[PDB]
Design a protein around this motif. Sequence first.
Motif, short mmCIF file in Angstrom:
data_model
loop_
_atom_site.label_atom_id
_atom_site.label_comp_id
_atom_site.label_asym_id
_atom_site.label_seq_id
_atom_site.Cartn_x
_atom_site.Cartn_y
_atom_site.Cartn_z
N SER A 7 15.46 56.38 23.73
CA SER A 7 15.16 57.18 22.76
C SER A 7 16.11 56.26 21.58
O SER A 7 16.98 55.71 21.67
CB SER A 7 15.36 58.66 22.56
N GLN A 8 15.74 56.65 20.25
CA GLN A 8 16.34 56.11 18.95
C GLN A 8 16.49 54.88 18.82
O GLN A 8 17.41 54.14 18.22
CB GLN A 8 17.79 56.92 18.77
N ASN A 9 15.50 54.03 19.49
CA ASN A 9 15.60 52.70 19.62
C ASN A 9 14.49 52.01 18.23
O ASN A 9 13.72 51.53 18.77
CB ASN A 9 15.24 51.92 20.94
N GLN A 10 14.93 52.47 17.26
CA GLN A 10 14.17 52.12 16.04
C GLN A 10 12.72 52.48 16.17
O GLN A 10 11.53 51.70 15.47
CB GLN A 10 14.06 50.44 15.79
N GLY A 11 12.37 53.42 16.74
CA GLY A 11 11.22 54.11 16.76
C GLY A 11 10.05 52.99 17.65
O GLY A 11 9.27 52.80 16.89
N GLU A 12 10.12 53.02 18.88
CA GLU A 12 9.46 51.92 19.61
C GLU A 12 8.63 52.67 20.69
O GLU A 12 8.24 52.17 21.61
CB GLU A 12 10.12 50.55 19.96
N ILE A 13 8.02 53.82 20.18
CA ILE A 13 7.09 54.65 21.12
C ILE A 13 6.03 54.94 20.58
O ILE A 13 5.69 55.29 19.48
CB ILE A 13 8.02 56.00 21.28
N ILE A 14 4.78 54.72 21.56
CA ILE A 14 3.47 54.80 21.19
C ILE A 14 2.86 55.46 22.16
O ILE A 14 2.81 54.88 23.30
CB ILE A 14 2.70 53.56 20.94
N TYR A 15 2.11 56.63 21.93
CA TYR A 15 1.11 57.49 22.87
C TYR A 15 -0.16 56.83 22.89
O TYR A 15 -1.00 57.20 22.10
CB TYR A 15 1.22 58.87 22.49
N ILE A 16 -0.42 55.56 23.29
CA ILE A 16 -1.44 54.95 23.50
C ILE A 16 -2.48 55.46 24.45
O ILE A 16 -2.32 55.56 25.69
CB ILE A 16 -1.15 53.38 23.43
#
Length: 49
Positions: A7-16
Amino acid sequence: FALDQPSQNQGEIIYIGGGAGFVSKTLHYKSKNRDQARNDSFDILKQLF
RNA sequence: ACGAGAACGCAGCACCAGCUGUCCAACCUGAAGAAGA
């Protein structure tokens, strides 16, 4: 068992994709308050199921 | 027994010669398989 979830890694999360949740489908809780966003969600989901 | 009688306004001759129904133009615009099965 781990559920690390980096988490908190420059916003690199996508619910694809799909089959994950109804939060990614309805977009009102990114501009409201938790109680208020849940109240609006309840109002809009009373018509469904 | 008429200013008369007889006398084809007739003969030959291509409505024809040249000429793009062409020129420009996107079938294009906007739109999750989620959701309590």
